[PDB]
Design an enzyme around this catalytic site. Structure first.
Site, PDB file in Angstrom:
ATOM      1  N   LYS A  58       0.829  -1.185   0.000  1.00 52.69           N
ATOM      2  CA  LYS A  58       0.000   0.000   0.000  1.00 52.69           C
ATOM      3  C   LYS A  58       0.878   1.254   0.000  1.00 52.69           C
ATOM      4  CE  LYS A  58      -4.284  -0.404  -0.010  1.00 52.69           C
ATOM      5  NZ  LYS A  58      -5.641   0.200  -0.003  1.00 52.69           N
ATOM      6  N   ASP A  67      -7.721   4.071  -4.235  1.00 55.48           N
ATOM      7  CA  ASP A  67      -8.175   3.933  -2.819  1.00 55.48           C
ATOM      8  C   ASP A  67      -8.707   5.345  -2.519  1.00 55.48           C
ATOM      9  OD1 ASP A  67      -7.957   1.755  -0.356  1.00 55.48           O
ATOM     10  OD2 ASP A  67      -7.719   3.789   0.486  1.00 55.48           O
TER      11      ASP A  67
HETATM   12  N1  LIG Z   1     -11.464   1.517  -4.543  1.00 53.75           N
HETATM   13  C1  LIG Z   1     -11.203   0.236  -4.276  1.00 53.75           C
HETATM   14  O1  LIG Z   1     -11.092  -0.578  -5.167  1.00 53.75           O
HETATM   15  C2  LIG Z   1     -11.155  -0.307  -2.870  1.00 53.75           C
HETATM   16  C3  LIG Z   1     -10.872  -1.788  -2.749  1.00 53.75           C
HETATM   17  C4  LIG Z   1     -10.925  -2.261  -1.369  1.00 53.75           C
HETATM   18  C5  LIG Z   1     -11.160  -1.389  -0.320  1.00 53.75           C
HETATM   19  N2  LIG Z   1     -11.370  -0.060  -0.484  1.00 53.75           N
HETATM   20  C6  LIG Z   1     -11.664   0.720   0.739  1.00 53.75           C
HETATM   21  O2  LIG Z   1     -13.016   1.275   0.721  1.00 53.75           O
HETATM   22  C7  LIG Z   1     -13.080   2.469   1.491  1.00 53.75           C
HETATM   23  C8  LIG Z   1     -13.498   3.679   0.624  1.00 53.75           C
HETATM   24  O3  LIG Z   1     -12.906   3.488  -0.645  1.00 53.75           O
HETATM   25  P1  LIG Z   1     -13.137   4.318  -2.039  1.00 53.75           P
HETATM   26  O4  LIG Z   1     -12.391   5.557  -1.549  1.00 53.75           O
HETATM   27  O5  LIG Z   1     -12.206   3.828  -3.133  1.00 53.75           O
HETATM   28  O6  LIG Z   1     -14.169   5.442  -2.314  1.00 53.75           O
HETATM   29  P2  LIG Z   1     -13.615   7.096  -2.502  1.00 53.75           P
HETATM   30  O7  LIG Z   1     -14.017   7.257  -3.920  1.00 53.75           O
HETATM   31  O8  LIG Z   1     -12.432   7.785  -1.990  1.00 53.75           O
HETATM   32  O9  LIG Z   1     -14.786   7.634  -1.536  1.00 53.75           O
HETATM   33  C9  LIG Z   1     -14.617   7.518  -0.115  1.00 53.75           C
HETATM   34  C10 LIG Z   1     -15.860   8.017   0.655  1.00 53.75           C
HETATM   35  O10 LIG Z   1     -15.641   7.925   2.069  1.00 53.75           O
HETATM   36  C11 LIG Z   1     -15.963   9.152   2.715  1.00 53.75           C
HETATM   37  N3  LIG Z   1     -14.999   9.341   3.819  1.00 53.75           N
HETATM   38  C12 LIG Z   1     -13.654   9.325   3.654  1.00 53.75           C
HETATM   39  N4  LIG Z   1     -13.005   9.481   4.834  1.00 53.75           N
HETATM   40  C13 LIG Z   1     -13.984   9.603   5.758  1.00 53.75           C
HETATM   41  C14 LIG Z   1     -13.956   9.816   7.198  1.00 53.75           C
HETATM   42  N5  LIG Z   1     -12.690   9.887   7.694  1.00 53.75           N
HETATM   43  N6  LIG Z   1     -15.172   9.876   7.890  1.00 53.75           N
HETATM   44  C15 LIG Z   1     -16.376   9.754   7.250  1.00 53.75           C
HETATM   45  N7  LIG Z   1     -16.432   9.581   5.897  1.00 53.75           N
HETATM   46  C16 LIG Z   1     -15.302   9.497   5.121  1.00 53.75           C
HETATM   47  C17 LIG Z   1     -15.836  10.184   1.612  1.00 53.75           C
HETATM   48  O11 LIG Z   1     -16.458  11.439   1.960  1.00 53.75           O
HETATM   49  P3  LIG Z   1     -15.579  12.786   1.729  1.00 53.75           P
HETATM   50  O12 LIG Z   1     -15.715  13.015   0.255  1.00 53.75           O
HETATM   51  O13 LIG Z   1     -16.374  13.772   2.540  1.00 53.75           O
HETATM   52  O14 LIG Z   1     -14.224  12.562   2.268  1.00 53.75           O
HETATM   53  C18 LIG Z   1     -16.326   9.438   0.358  1.00 53.75           C
HETATM   54  O15 LIG Z   1     -17.749   9.445   0.156  1.00 53.75           O
HETATM   55  C19 LIG Z   1     -11.661   2.628   2.021  1.00 53.75           C
HETATM   56  O16 LIG Z   1     -11.565   2.133   3.353  1.00 53.75           O
HETATM   57  C20 LIG Z   1     -10.764   1.890   1.051  1.00 53.75           C
HETATM   58  O17 LIG Z   1      -9.521   1.523   1.671  1.00 53.75           O
HETATM   59  C21 LIG Z   1     -11.394   0.469  -1.720  1.00 53.75           C
HETATM   60  O1  LIG Z   2      -6.884  -3.149  -6.740  1.00 52.44           O
HETATM   61  C1  LIG Z   2      -6.030  -2.778  -5.937  1.00 52.44           C
HETATM   62  O2  LIG Z   2      -4.905  -3.243  -5.804  1.00 52.44           O
HETATM   63  C2  LIG Z   2      -6.416  -1.609  -5.132  1.00 52.44           C
HETATM   64  C3  LIG Z   2      -7.398  -2.040  -4.102  1.00 52.44           C
HETATM   65  C4  LIG Z   2      -6.783  -2.230  -2.758  1.00 52.44           C
HETATM   66  O3  LIG Z   2      -5.746  -1.687  -2.360  1.00 52.44           O
HETATM   67  C5  LIG Z   2      -7.618  -3.013  -1.886  1.00 52.44           C
HETATM   68  O4  LIG Z   2      -8.017  -4.118  -2.292  1.00 52.44           O
HETATM   69  O5  LIG Z   2      -7.965  -2.509  -0.777  1.00 52.44           O
END
Ligand SMILES: NC(=O)c1ccc[n+]([C@@H]2O[C@H](COP(=O)([O-])OP(=O)(O)OC[C@H]3O[C@@H](n4cnc5c(N)ncnc54)[C@H](OP(=O)(O)O)[C@@H]3O)[C@@H](O)[C@H]2O)c1
Ligand SMILES: O=C(O)CCC(=O)C(=O)O
Ligand SMILES: NC(=O)c1ccc[n+]([C@@H]2O[C@H](COP(=O)([O-])OP(=O)(O)OC[C@H]3O[C@@H](n4cnc5c(N)ncnc54)[C@H](OP(=O)(O)O)[C@@H]3O)[C@@H](O)[C@H]2O)c1
Ligand SMILES: NC(=O)c1ccc[n+]([C@@H]2O[C@H](COP(=O)([O-])OP(=O)(O)OC[C@H]3O[C@@H](n4cnc5c(N)ncnc54)[C@H](OP(=O)(O)O)[C@@H]3O)[C@@H](O)[C@H]2O)c1
Ligand SMILES: NC(=O)c1ccc[n+]([C@@H]2O[C@H](COP(=O)([O-])OP(=O)(O)OC[C@H]3O[C@@H](n4cnc5c(N)ncnc54)[C@H](OP(=O)(O)O)[C@@H]3O)[C@@H](O)[C@H]2O)c1
Ligand SMILES: O=C(O)CCC(=O)C(=O)O
Ligand SMILES: O=C(O)CCC(=O)C(=O)O
Ligand SMILES: O=C(O)CCC(=O)C(=O)O
Lengths: 447, 447, 447, 447
Positions: free
Chosen positions: D128, D168
């Site tokens: 990461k 992310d």
């Molecule tokens: N994208 C992927 O493929 C992926 C894969 C596995 C896991 N994840 C996980 O899923 C979660 C969100 O991912 P995503 O970001 O990719 O969507 P993102 O597009 O960045 O959107 C994140 C969302 O979370 C809200 N948020 C962020 N920090 C916050 C906080 N500290 N308190 C309350 N709300 C908060 C944001 O609101 P604001 O706009 O107001 O900040 C936004 O609506 C994370 O934990 C990430 O590690 C993502």
């Molecule tokens: O597809 C990836 O490697 C980004 C997603 C990631 O970091 C996750 O699975 O939380």
């Protein structure tokens, strides 16, 4: 002036420049006899120094391998990598860790490797290496430290497109693990294609463990069918009890043959009602024990340090241990006891006097560069899987292996006949192997 | 203020920065005419200096190529490689060895390559290279030495993901062998993806030799069907007699057309009952003779050094030799004599006055960036096979080539229609080519 | 248990591992015969496998060298580079092009280079290489192409901090030019430090030509200085006629000294009050003649061809050609003639039977590894100048070459006393060479 | 002596060596609880410092990222890449750009990633990265300048076989474009496999945008079926409104559930009749607006800055925002309100107390490392396509995703029952993840 004399002269140059390497001489001599045939029909194959280029390795590496033992004492063994020919693909071939290893042996193996790899129909050049290190009696931690020291030098000469090693005598699953591990540490790359024979959770292919023995049995089946017989109900001798022997035994019995014996370097076992493969594997893989332990723990099975495994009456002989294990005299007694088929699982098990005997006595002979090619073929499939980041089922890979062995049989038997030596699979293999390499060398210029 | 003035002022700057390069100006001018149409509807395709970036090569290499002839005399030629655009993939494009080659020519070909490659739907950027070296009358060894010297410098600018050359005028199978062999020797890698047009035993693809000419005929057949006609029974002129022309001729006559003439730079042959392809291949590829020899040896076939091949009464013209080989007067004559379709096997063979005559006379016109894209398409299929370590059948790859030419035709026809210029394939191809490169460029930032 | 049982068992293992290489066996034996002495007084010098590491090359390279002759005909020679030890610096040692070169010989020369280079006091390790290529009767084109082909493989294993080659038999100024040029071509780096022996206007050093010669003589300036026999006037039989011998002679009449004539592998000479080098230098370098083309003159110089070079009245004798030119009848009839001093200039110039004939016969030896080290010393001064981008005047470099040669004699004297075989310079040379290298290996760990 | 003692002492170490990183302690704590269960049955998984090696990153990079804002003002942020574990493949995982980012957080994410990636079945190791940069309020050119500066350092630590980043929080499609584009410029390679989350015309994969949210809903659906219930007709809370939230919502509603609320960090929206997905996407991706704007524009939806999203009465809660967004009290409120299933879209959204409440209230709990693995599984499929230069259809890829998420659920359930804790999917995920990785690490030695 005649072909016969051009070739005999290069062979005498070769003896001069490679003095002291009898196994290399032996390998080149068998191939050069076949090339005479080829140059009598097509003399352009000698153009642009092609033969001179062919028998000279592209690159050879010999290096110091220091390592510290469990008593904290330092040892020094010698490591080798011969990169023989890359006209068809990256250099491809295994690593032998055995106290017998010297440059002459590594060159014999790498040279054979060219023609074998060519016969697979797959995109692979030829190479080999190893070390005079003796893994027997060493702890895992000593083997590990040796693998690490060895790969510390070797890493800079290998790569997915450069040179792709694998196992052989003294190098199985365990050593490939330590080798790959330490490669990633040196290169800071998870380069799956750098080695074959890997484990299944880190980039390996499903049929590779079984491939050489399976392929050898698949090839002998083809030879048996072309003579009007079937491998079912046949009696089979398999020398060896390592990676190749185990799986040749397994495949021969799945197809309905009976394996009447096997061996290690200490002696051999008579198993007149077949082998219990699970038992042989418990014995060699878990216990690291001698073939004699099988005999004591299996009723019907008797140990022998006398005579030779080749004294057994059989229909089929599969030598799967090492080079020059089946001499002229071994060949006489099998022929007198009714053996009609021999296929080599090992690299150059049959001495040249044994191969002459097989021909005089009308015994069908599958040379190693053909019959043991299932391994390097399946390694190339592992490479293909790695380059695609794909992982194939056992049933898919094994089907591919079956078809490869049939096609190798077919080009050996057709090339043999094309050049007026029908049923001489040695001629067939040597010529088909040679022509694909030479045509690629001519395309690619003087390099 | 006006889109027209903006593009025109930019074209004016580009004549200043690239003074003395008429062919580059000519290729750029035709594209930019089509871009006026895009920007009048979607002005944001001009944002972030996008067109200013597009028309400037990412990188241009010029280098000395010294070589020694068969009399031990040193010659010096000039080498070129233009890496134009890499938004969609590695730079991709051939090498031209011909005495007319200069930087202007390499850039026109590089520039066109961007849009053609985009149109294939496959992940490849645009470049081109070559030398002013003249292969004609050189021995195989002199050619090998040239290729080896040329690649001694080029090897460091190319690679499987960086830049993948191929052939073009003066560069065919022979030269690709020598270039590839030497690349491997410079890199110490058997890196198959570094070149396309390779031979079948060292990483080539089955349909690639035939691909451009075949593709050209596939494309024109769609043009033909769009008017309610068939290619069967049509009389076709194919200028040139190299790689493109040969297989355009082969394809056209397999589909039942008759090729009524072909040419080289010395003159032209009238063949009213069609062309004997195997005889023309023997003359061109074995004997490296003039087309006049074909006429000498083939009954019904007449050699001409007077007039033009474009004087013959045809239904279909396929220029497959070189740039600016079919001019405005040629275009009138063709139209007068009944020509209804023109597709470019070659790169930019029709001059701007010729292109307008086709527009004035409602001759359906297949520009080279669409019609000749089968070559580079099949090259991308070569790279795909190499990346996977796989080998596809002739039938599989040919079927893919067919679908790809049909998709290209459709994209050019629908895009032309979308922008108000129905059946103007130049417009469709330019725009469709442009939009995908631009979208990628905007996403990847200022680089 | 005893110090003589480690040594003789490792010497015995070393015969198994390096079978067929007697010159390497000899050179290892003599060095080991000296390490016995070191061990009695300093037992920690055998720690951590030090000797087992020292006698195995860090790396050995053997490679195909294909090249094309003036007839367009392909040849294949074998090239070598042994990189023995790098404890004190990058590998350092010359390249020999001669039909007698093989792995055994390169290993032996490379092994001796370690201690020669150690003795100089400068930061150089030891290596050697070359080829079985025969530069006799080759055109300049053929030699350039050979050099190009050779360096095409060698460049990836060498470099200013990695490995710095030089000339030797068959590799003079002309070849170094060709090797250096091509090295730069491959690397795209003007890396002057990659080679020594370069021409003056492209990174060479001013005393390099005259160094080995001026060496043998600056050494004698303390070696005879311990006895009497005049600070002048003494005869010098100078066995050779290339870089080392010509200039050994050239270093005559420093402050007054008769010379006698010289040899090659054809024949020798005898003369009054000198041998004026003016006339040898126009015929031996710039024309490349025989010793018959000097000896047809020279107001005295006469030419013997059946006999031996060691049947001249001495009383000092300075060989400088190849290994193994002093044996049973020469060594004893060197001593006969009331004849006293020696300062031999080859690599291992006398044999193991000749050395006993100088020991027992009270003959004050100036060994190989100490007295002709001026060449390698001046190579290192070339490396130094390149590293700083300075070009030193002749006076200065020559002066530094005198300091260095003082110290070599000094460390040979002082250490031969320290171990109580005082004035057997063979011994102090051999021990001081060993201890510096051993000490560095111990400090730098198991590597 | 006890496993409980052995693991707890290790944990106390880890707390000292990593003081001040609570998120990292939290994540390591929960994994170590499950590992006690593994060691009580199979204590040779602790052999060779396995656990001590697993919990210490292979490599961690912290670097300066200078950049200039649109007012010419220089800012300095901090960049991170943690390369946690490469046993199963190249390091794999996203980049987080948010002001809360520090090393301890990156390590928590990287550590979870090892086990998540193992669970997918696909050949990817764990890592990461990120930055404390806040992209909120920045222009597209500011964001591009930051990504360019970030990648100027990052490019040398990454690569298709080395380390493959992705998005992310704060890093979506726009940023991956800038990052990728600058990577190609730094490397001069069109190396598609260097990053995932790429755009469709430059090496991206269909389904990747949707994959994490889709996969989370596919996982929870299996959890629900395994209780003998069905997802259709259920009320679901999805926290967040970014990439993960958006497509969980879309998928849950496609399957016939009603999403009754969602959020950003400024507040939440109550949507009692379901979410209008097109509207949300327009608000969040085109206007880059707050969820309050959705409430303003959609009748029946209500904005709240009071209380918590978890106050809504639901059947399933899907936290898809961030770490520790669902606490102890939240879990009691949900349980009390009728919630029966929690699956984690986000990484570690449920506090240790929250998870306790779930265990005690009989709520089924889909941990992040299982439930959100659809993202990284689909990235690995993107790598696979890129390695093959291939493009897969949406249908085919989304069916691969469905099977994988079914297989992850299956391995969690089966593994949990296998070790005596049926329906504890935390235990099942942690053990299954660990075992593949630990097996690979044992095979590869101490590296
Ligand atoms: N994208 C992927 O493929 C992926 C894969 C596995 C896991 N994840 C996980 O899923 C979660 C969100 O991912 P995503 O970001 O990719 O969507 P993102 O597009 O960045 O959107 C994140 C969302 O979370 C809200 N948020 C962020 N920090 C916050 C906080 N500290 N308190 C309350 N709300 C908060 C944001 O609101 P604001 O706009 O107001 O900040 C936004 O609506 C994370 O934990 C990430 O590690 C993502
Ligand atoms: O597809 C990836 O490697 C980004 C997603 C990631 O970091 C996750 O699975 O939380
Ligand atoms: N593995 C492959 O994929 C592969 C592919 C093609 C060819 N080969 C060839 O197959 C042969 C054996 O390979 P392997 O990989 O099975 O090696 P392995 O697993 O190390 O087994 C070798 C077997 O041969 C025995 N052996 C060694 N020297 C012997 C002798 N003089 N007489 C009788 N038995 C002897 C060993 O017994 P001890 O324990 O008593 O030494 C052991 O049972 C070699 O010729 C190798 O090059 C292997
Ligand atoms: N090969 C490909 O894959 C490919 C792909 C797309 C487009 N193209 C284009 O197709 C065209 C032909 O390529 P090729 O690969 O067929 O080349 P080629 O095999 O070298 O053949 C070129 C042919 O055109 C003739 N020609 C060349 N220059 C000429 C000139 N300046 N004036 C009149 N005639 C001339 C040649 O005759 P002479 O022997 O008298 O010169 C020869 O018959 C070129 O425009 C090339 O850029 C090629
Ligand atoms: N500065 C240095 O180059 C340097 C530094 C350290 C050590 N050395 C050592 O010094 C020696 C001389 O090398 P070089 O650089 O002077 O080579 P060079 O310039 O090529 O000359 C070598 C000479 O030795 C002659 N020779 C060959 N076989 C002989 C025999 N059986 N008896 C007497 N002479 C014979 C050669 O004659 P043909 O020409 O007829 O063959 C030739 O005249 C080598 O052993 C080398 O290892 C040299
Ligand atoms: O699969 C490999 O590369 C090992 C094959 C080999 O060394 C052999 O063919 O004997
Ligand atoms: O890259 C290739 O396959 C050669 C195609 C080419 O350069 C062209 O499209 O003219
Ligand atoms: O490397 C050097 O300069 C001298 C050593 C040597 O063996 C030679 O040049 O012949």
């Amino acid at each position: 002036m005649t072909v016969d004399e051009q070739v005999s002269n290069y062979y005498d140059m070769l003896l001069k420049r490679n003095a002291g390497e009898p196994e290399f001489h032996q390998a080149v001599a068998e191939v050069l006899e076949s090339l005479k045939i080829v140059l009598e029909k097509d003399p352009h194959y000698a153009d642009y120094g092609l033969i001179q280029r062919l028998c000279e390795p592209e690159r050879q590496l010999i290096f110091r391998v220091p390592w510290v033992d469990d008593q904290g004492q330092v040892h020094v063994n010698r490591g080798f990598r011969v990169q023989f020919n890359s006209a068809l693909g990256p250099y491809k071939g295994g690593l032998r860790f055995h106290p017998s290893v010297n440059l002459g042996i590594v060159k014999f193996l790498g040279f054979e490797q060219i023609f074998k790899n060519s016969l697979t129909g797959l995109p692979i050049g030829g190479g080999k290496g190893g070390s005079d290190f003796d893994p027997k009696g060493k702890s895992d931690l000593e083997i590990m430290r040796f693998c690490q020291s060895f790969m510390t030098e070797l890493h800079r000469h290998i790569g997915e497109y450069r040179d792709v090693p694998a196992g052989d005598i003294g190098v199985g699953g365990r050593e490939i693990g330590y080798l790959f591990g330490h490669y990633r540490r040196m290169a800071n790359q998870h380069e799956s294609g750098v080695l074959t024979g890997k484990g299944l959770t880190w980039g390996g292919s499903l049929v590779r463990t079984e491939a050489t023995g399976y392929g050898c049995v698949y090839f002998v089946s083809e030879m048996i069918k072309a003579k009007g017989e079937s491998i079912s109900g046949q009696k089979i001798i398999v020398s060896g009890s390592g990676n190749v022997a185990t799986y040749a035994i397994e495949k021969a019995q799945e197809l309905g043959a009976t394996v009447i014996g096997f061996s290690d370097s200490s002696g051999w076992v008579h198993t007149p009602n077949g082998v219990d493969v699970a038992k042989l594997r418990e014995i060699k893989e878990v216990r690291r024990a001698r073939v004699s332990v099988y005999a004591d723990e299996v009723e019907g099975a008797t140990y022998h340090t006398d005579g030779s495994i080749w004294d057994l009456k059989c229909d089929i002989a599969l030598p799967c241990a090492t080079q020059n294990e089946l001499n002229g005299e071994n060949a006489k007694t099998l022929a007198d006891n009714g053996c009609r088929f021999v296929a080599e699982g090992a690299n150059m098990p049959s001495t040249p006097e044994a191969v002459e005997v097989f021909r005089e006595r009308d015994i069908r002979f599958g040379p190693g560069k053909a019959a043991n090619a299932g391994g390097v073929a399946t390694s190339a499939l592992e490479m293909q899987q790695n380059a695609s980041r794909d992982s194939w089922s056992f049933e898919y890979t094994d089907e591919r292996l079956q078809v490869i062995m049939k096609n190798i049989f077919k080009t050996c038997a057709e090339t043999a006949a094309e050049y007026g030596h029908e049923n001489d699979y040695v001629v067939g293999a040597n010529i088909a192997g040679f022509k694909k390499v030479a045509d690629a060398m001519l395309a690619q210029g003087v390099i």
